[PDB]
Amino acid sequence: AQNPNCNIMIFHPTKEEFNDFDKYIAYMESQGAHRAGLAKIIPPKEWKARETYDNISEILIATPLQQVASGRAGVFTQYHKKKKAMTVGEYRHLANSKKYQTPPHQNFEDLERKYWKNRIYNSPIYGADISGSLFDENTKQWNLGHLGTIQDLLEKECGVVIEGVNTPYLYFGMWKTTFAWHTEDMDLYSINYLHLGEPKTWYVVPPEHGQRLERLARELFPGSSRGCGAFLRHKVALISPTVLKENGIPFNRITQEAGEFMVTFPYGYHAGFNHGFNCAEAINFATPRWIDYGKMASQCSCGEARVTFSMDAFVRILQPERYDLWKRGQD
Ligand SMILES: O=C(O)CNC(=O)C(=O)O
Ligand SMILES: [Mg+2]
Ligand code: NI
Ligand SMILES: [Zn+2]
């Protein structure tokens, strides 16, 4: 069995190997990459996502989210308070203000320490989940707005034709902005490209051990667990590495830098934070190996998780028994 320790693998495809996306995902899996839950892909030196970023300040963040924490430093939840719209230019200035800027620090490790120590005492503002793309239309390789769609994968594998579309989303971050512990909708893959700016630190639990994280989360957030049998679908809970190590949960960590892709694999729980102002683009995708995970994915039916239009068909076709209850929580 390849990668039996479930380490995060880092790949350096050549320009030739960068031509066929599906093939390269399958290659990474042949090497055991999926066992980690997360992989890093460093693009060939000849590749570029776009010519320059010189013209991004006019993008609108219609609903910036202030991430307010409750709990203790290592075990907390966050809620998103909606703020008034602002442009990327405005947001970048805000990120660089004395209130919100990255503090002095020695290296990524020192900054990680300061994040876990101090996150809960501040409420950073995140421009998340903005439909759009920053890939140039002429970028042919690993262009996240030109991937094969999940609908088309399900059609090719299973023969059924469904509604729905699959488009990318932009994420504008600042110091301390946080993504809570989650897997993807329907335990899909995700791919995330860091277009510009400061790094993003990731934590991941191997898919084969995801249920260990779920059991710990039920212990640590006991009211949330009573409210919903899939409450990590709410995307609100944070658990630090120290707490994970105290409780014997297998995990790994890695820092993504601008110009780098990350792939999360089906049922790979992940969480993380941004180091300073940055912009990422991400999208879900499927492969044939995903279908069995889609069939088994937990679902929130309490009403909190509320997701996209396209998840309907996935639930309806892959999880017909659950469909009625899940849709009640959607409506
Ligand atoms: O970048 C972020 O805030 C969160 N991204 C992801 O969870 C992902 O790409 O799957
Ligand atoms: Mg612009
Ligand atoms: Ni994710
Ligand atoms: Zn729920």
Coordinates of C-alpha atoms and ligand atoms in Angstrom, one line a residue:
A1 CA 0.0 0.0 0.0
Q2 CA 1.5 3.3 -1.0
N3 CA 1.9 6.1 1.6
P4 CA 0.8 4.0 4.6
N5 CA 1.7 6.7 7.1
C6 CA -0.8 9.1 5.3
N7 CA 1.8 11.9 4.9
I8 CA 0.9 14.9 2.8
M9 CA 2.7 14.5 -0.6
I10 CA 4.1 17.3 -2.7
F11 CA 4.1 16.9 -6.5
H12 CA 6.1 18.7 -9.1
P13 CA 4.6 18.0 -12.5
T14 CA 6.4 18.8 -15.7
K15 CA 4.7 20.9 -18.3
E16 CA 3.9 17.7 -20.2
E17 CA 2.4 16.1 -17.2
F18 CA 0.3 19.3 -16.5
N19 CA -1.8 18.8 -19.7
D20 CA -4.2 16.2 -18.5
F21 CA -5.8 17.0 -15.2
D22 CA -7.7 13.8 -14.7
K23 CA -4.7 11.7 -15.5
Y24 CA -2.5 13.5 -13.0
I25 CA -5.1 13.2 -10.2
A26 CA -5.1 9.4 -10.9
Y27 CA -1.3 9.4 -10.9
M28 CA -1.2 11.1 -7.5
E29 CA -3.6 8.5 -6.1
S30 CA -1.4 5.7 -7.6
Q31 CA 1.3 7.1 -5.3
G32 CA -1.0 7.1 -2.2
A33 CA -1.6 10.9 -2.1
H34 CA -5.2 10.5 -1.2
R35 CA -4.4 8.7 2.0
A36 CA -3.3 12.0 3.5
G37 CA -6.5 13.8 2.6
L38 CA -4.6 16.7 1.1
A39 CA -1.8 17.0 -1.5
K40 CA 0.2 20.0 -2.7
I41 CA 0.9 20.5 -6.5
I42 CA 3.7 22.9 -7.5
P43 CA 3.0 24.0 -11.2
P44 CA 5.7 23.7 -13.8
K45 CA 7.9 26.8 -13.9
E46 CA 6.6 27.6 -17.4
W47 CA 3.0 27.9 -16.2
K48 CA 1.1 31.0 -15.2
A49 CA -2.6 31.5 -14.0
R50 CA -2.8 34.9 -15.5
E51 CA -0.4 37.6 -16.7
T52 CA -0.8 40.0 -13.8
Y53 CA -3.1 40.7 -10.9
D54 CA -2.8 44.4 -11.5
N55 CA -6.4 44.9 -12.1
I56 CA -8.3 43.0 -9.1
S57 CA -9.2 45.8 -6.8
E58 CA -12.5 46.4 -8.5
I59 CA -13.9 43.0 -7.6
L60 CA -16.8 43.4 -5.1
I61 CA -17.0 41.5 -1.9
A62 CA -20.8 41.9 -1.5
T63 CA -21.0 40.3 1.9
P64 CA -17.7 40.3 3.9
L65 CA -18.0 38.0 6.9
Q66 CA -16.6 39.0 10.4
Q67 CA -15.6 35.7 12.1
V68 CA -16.5 36.0 15.7
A69 CA -15.2 33.2 18.0
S70 CA -16.6 31.7 21.2
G71 CA -14.9 29.0 23.4
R72 CA -11.3 28.6 24.4
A73 CA -8.2 29.1 22.4
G74 CA -7.9 25.5 21.3
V75 CA -11.6 24.6 21.0
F76 CA -13.9 27.2 19.7
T77 CA -16.7 27.9 17.3
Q78 CA -17.0 30.8 14.9
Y79 CA -20.0 32.7 13.6
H80 CA -20.1 34.9 10.6
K81 CA -21.5 38.4 11.1
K82 CA -22.4 40.0 7.7
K83 CA -20.7 43.3 7.0
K84 CA -21.4 46.0 4.4
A85 CA -20.0 45.4 0.9
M86 CA -16.5 46.5 0.0
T87 CA -14.2 46.3 -3.0
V88 CA -11.1 44.1 -3.0
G89 CA -9.1 47.4 -2.9
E90 CA -10.9 48.4 0.2
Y91 CA -10.5 45.0 1.8
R92 CA -6.8 44.9 1.0
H93 CA -6.4 48.2 2.7
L94 CA -8.3 47.0 5.7
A95 CA -6.2 43.8 5.9
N96 CA -3.0 45.9 6.0
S97 CA -4.3 48.2 8.7
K98 CA -2.8 48.2 12.1
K99 CA -5.9 46.5 13.6
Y100 CA -5.9 43.6 11.1
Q101 CA -2.3 43.2 9.8
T102 CA -0.1 40.2 10.3
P103 CA 2.0 40.7 13.5
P104 CA 5.8 40.6 13.6
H105 CA 6.9 37.0 13.6
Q106 CA 10.1 34.9 13.1
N107 CA 8.9 32.2 10.8
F108 CA 5.7 30.2 9.8
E109 CA 6.0 28.2 13.1
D110 CA 6.0 31.3 15.3
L111 CA 3.1 32.7 13.3
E112 CA 1.2 29.4 13.8
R113 CA 1.8 29.7 17.6
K114 CA 0.5 33.2 17.6
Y115 CA -2.6 32.1 15.6
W116 CA -3.6 29.4 18.1
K117 CA -2.8 31.5 21.1
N118 CA -4.6 34.7 20.0
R119 CA -7.2 33.9 17.3
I120 CA -10.2 33.9 19.6
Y121 CA -9.5 37.4 20.8
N122 CA -9.9 39.0 17.4
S123 CA -12.6 38.9 14.7
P124 CA -11.0 39.0 11.2
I125 CA -13.1 39.7 8.1
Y126 CA -13.2 37.0 5.3
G127 CA -14.4 37.6 1.7
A128 CA -15.5 34.1 1.1
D129 CA -17.4 32.1 -1.4
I130 CA -17.5 34.8 -4.1
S131 CA -18.6 33.2 -7.5
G132 CA -15.9 34.0 -10.1
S133 CA -12.5 33.2 -11.5
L134 CA -9.2 34.8 -11.8
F135 CA -7.7 32.4 -14.4
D136 CA -7.1 33.9 -17.8
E137 CA -9.3 32.3 -20.4
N138 CA -6.2 31.5 -22.3
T139 CA -4.7 29.4 -19.5
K140 CA -5.4 25.9 -20.7
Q141 CA -3.8 23.8 -18.0
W142 CA -5.3 23.5 -14.5
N143 CA -7.7 26.3 -15.1
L144 CA -10.3 25.9 -12.4
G145 CA -13.0 27.4 -14.4
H146 CA -12.5 24.8 -17.2
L147 CA -12.7 21.6 -15.4
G148 CA -15.0 18.7 -16.3
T149 CA -18.2 19.1 -14.2
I150 CA -19.4 16.9 -11.4
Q151 CA -22.6 16.5 -13.3
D152 CA -20.8 15.2 -16.3
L153 CA -18.8 12.8 -14.2
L154 CA -21.9 11.4 -12.6
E155 CA -23.5 11.1 -16.0
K156 CA -20.4 9.3 -17.5
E157 CA -20.1 6.9 -14.5
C158 CA -23.8 6.2 -13.8
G159 CA -25.7 7.1 -17.0
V160 CA -28.0 9.6 -15.4
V161 CA -28.5 13.1 -16.6
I162 CA -29.0 15.8 -14.0
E163 CA -29.4 19.5 -13.7
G164 CA -26.9 21.7 -12.0
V165 CA -23.7 23.5 -12.7
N166 CA -20.3 23.6 -11.0
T167 CA -18.4 27.0 -10.9
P168 CA -15.4 28.3 -9.0
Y169 CA -15.3 30.6 -6.0
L170 CA -12.9 33.3 -4.8
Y171 CA -11.7 33.7 -1.3
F172 CA -10.1 37.0 -0.1
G173 CA -8.4 36.4 3.3
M174 CA -6.5 38.4 5.9
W175 CA -4.5 37.5 9.0
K176 CA -6.4 35.0 11.2
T177 CA -9.2 34.4 8.8
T178 CA -10.2 30.8 9.4
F179 CA -11.8 27.8 7.7
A180 CA -13.4 25.4 10.1
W181 CA -13.1 21.6 10.2
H182 CA -15.0 20.2 7.3
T183 CA -15.2 17.8 4.4
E184 CA -16.6 19.0 1.1
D185 CA -20.3 18.8 0.1
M186 CA -21.1 15.2 -0.7
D187 CA -17.5 14.4 0.3
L188 CA -16.3 15.7 -3.1
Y189 CA -12.7 16.6 -3.9
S190 CA -11.7 20.2 -3.8
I191 CA -8.8 22.0 -5.6
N192 CA -7.6 25.4 -4.4
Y193 CA -5.2 27.7 -6.0
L194 CA -3.5 30.5 -4.0
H195 CA -3.4 33.3 -6.6
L196 CA -1.6 35.9 -4.7
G197 CA -0.6 37.2 -1.3
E198 CA 0.3 35.7 2.0
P199 CA 0.2 31.9 2.8
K200 CA -2.5 29.6 4.0
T201 CA -1.8 27.0 6.6
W202 CA -3.8 23.7 6.3
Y203 CA -4.5 20.9 8.8
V204 CA -5.9 17.6 7.5
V205 CA -7.1 14.2 8.9
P206 CA -6.5 11.1 6.7
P207 CA -9.9 9.9 5.3
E208 CA -9.4 6.5 6.8
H209 CA -9.5 8.2 10.2
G210 CA -12.2 10.8 9.7
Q211 CA -14.5 9.2 12.1
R212 CA -11.9 9.7 14.9
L213 CA -12.2 13.4 14.3
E214 CA -16.0 13.2 14.3
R215 CA -16.0 11.4 17.7
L216 CA -13.8 14.0 19.2
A217 CA -15.9 16.8 17.8
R218 CA -19.0 15.2 19.4
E219 CA -17.2 15.2 22.8
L220 CA -15.9 18.8 22.5
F221 CA -19.1 20.4 21.1
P222 CA -21.7 18.3 22.9
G223 CA -24.7 20.7 22.4
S224 CA -23.9 21.0 18.7
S225 CA -23.7 17.2 18.5
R226 CA -27.2 16.8 20.1
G227 CA -28.7 19.4 17.6
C228 CA -27.4 17.6 14.5
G229 CA -25.9 14.2 13.7
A230 CA -23.6 15.9 11.1
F231 CA -22.8 19.2 12.7
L232 CA -19.3 19.6 11.1
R233 CA -21.4 20.3 8.0
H234 CA -22.1 23.7 9.6
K235 CA -18.5 24.6 9.1
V236 CA -18.1 26.4 12.5
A237 CA -15.9 24.3 14.7
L238 CA -12.2 24.7 15.3
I239 CA -9.9 22.3 17.2
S240 CA -6.2 23.1 17.5
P241 CA -3.3 20.8 16.7
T242 CA -2.4 20.7 20.4
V243 CA -5.9 19.4 21.2
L244 CA -5.8 17.0 18.4
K245 CA -2.4 15.6 19.6
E246 CA -3.8 15.4 23.2
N247 CA -6.6 13.2 22.0
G248 CA -4.6 11.1 19.7
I249 CA -6.2 12.2 16.4
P250 CA -4.0 11.5 13.4
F251 CA -3.4 14.7 11.3
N252 CA -0.9 16.6 9.3
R253 CA -0.2 20.2 8.5
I254 CA 1.3 22.1 5.6
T255 CA 1.5 25.7 4.4
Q256 CA 0.5 26.7 0.9
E257 CA 2.2 29.7 -0.8
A258 CA 1.1 31.8 -3.6
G259 CA 1.3 30.0 -6.9
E260 CA 0.6 26.6 -5.4
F261 CA -2.4 24.2 -5.7
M262 CA -3.8 22.1 -3.0
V263 CA -6.1 19.1 -3.6
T264 CA -8.4 17.8 -0.8
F265 CA -9.5 14.2 -1.3
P266 CA -13.0 12.7 -0.5
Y267 CA -13.7 12.6 3.2
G268 CA -10.4 14.4 4.0
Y269 CA -11.3 16.7 6.9
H270 CA -9.4 20.0 6.8
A271 CA -9.2 23.3 8.6
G272 CA -6.8 26.2 8.4
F273 CA -6.0 30.0 8.5
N274 CA -4.6 32.7 6.4
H275 CA -1.3 34.5 7.2
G276 CA -2.3 37.9 5.8
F277 CA -4.0 39.4 2.8
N278 CA -4.5 36.8 0.0
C279 CA -6.8 35.6 -2.8
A280 CA -7.5 31.9 -3.4
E281 CA -9.8 30.2 -5.9
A282 CA -11.4 26.9 -5.3
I283 CA -13.9 24.4 -6.8
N284 CA -15.2 21.0 -6.1
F285 CA -14.6 18.2 -8.5
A286 CA -15.3 14.4 -8.8
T287 CA -13.6 11.3 -10.2
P288 CA -14.8 7.8 -10.5
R289 CA -13.3 6.9 -7.1
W290 CA -15.5 9.6 -5.5
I291 CA -18.8 8.0 -6.3
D292 CA -18.6 5.5 -3.4
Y293 CA -17.9 8.4 -1.0
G294 CA -20.8 10.4 -2.4
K295 CA -23.1 7.5 -1.7
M296 CA -21.9 7.3 2.0
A297 CA -21.6 11.1 2.8
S298 CA -23.2 12.3 5.9
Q299 CA -25.8 14.9 5.7
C300 CA -27.0 17.8 7.8
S301 CA -30.8 17.7 7.8
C302 CA -31.2 20.3 10.8
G303 CA -31.4 23.2 8.4
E304 CA -28.2 24.8 9.4
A305 CA -25.9 23.6 6.5
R306 CA -28.0 25.0 3.7
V307 CA -26.1 24.5 0.4
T308 CA -26.1 24.9 -3.4
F309 CA -28.8 24.1 -5.9
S310 CA -26.6 21.4 -7.5
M311 CA -26.3 19.3 -4.3
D312 CA -30.0 18.4 -4.7
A313 CA -29.4 16.1 -7.6
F314 CA -26.4 14.5 -6.0
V315 CA -28.5 13.6 -2.9
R316 CA -31.5 12.6 -5.0
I317 CA -29.5 10.2 -7.2
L318 CA -26.8 8.9 -4.8
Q319 CA -28.8 8.9 -1.5
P320 CA -32.5 8.5 -2.4
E321 CA -33.4 7.2 1.1
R322 CA -32.0 10.4 2.6
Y323 CA -33.5 12.7 0.1
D324 CA -36.8 13.5 1.7
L325 CA -35.3 14.4 5.1
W326 CA -32.4 16.3 3.7
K327 CA -34.6 18.4 1.5
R328 CA -36.9 19.2 4.5
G329 CA -33.7 20.7 6.1
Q330 CA -33.1 22.6 2.8
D331 CA -36.6 24.1 2.9
Ligands
LIG1 O1 -9.5 28.6 1.4 C1 -10.4 28.5 2.2 O2 -10.9 29.4 3.1 C2 -11.2 27.2 2.4 N1 -10.9 26.3 1.2 C3 -11.3 25.0 1.3 O3 -11.9 24.5 2.3 C4 -11.0 24.2 0.1 O4 -10.4 24.7 -0.9 O5 -11.5 23.0 0.2
MG2 MG -11.1 44.8 -10.8
NI3 NI -12.7 22.7 1.8
ZN4 ZN -27.1 20.4 11.0

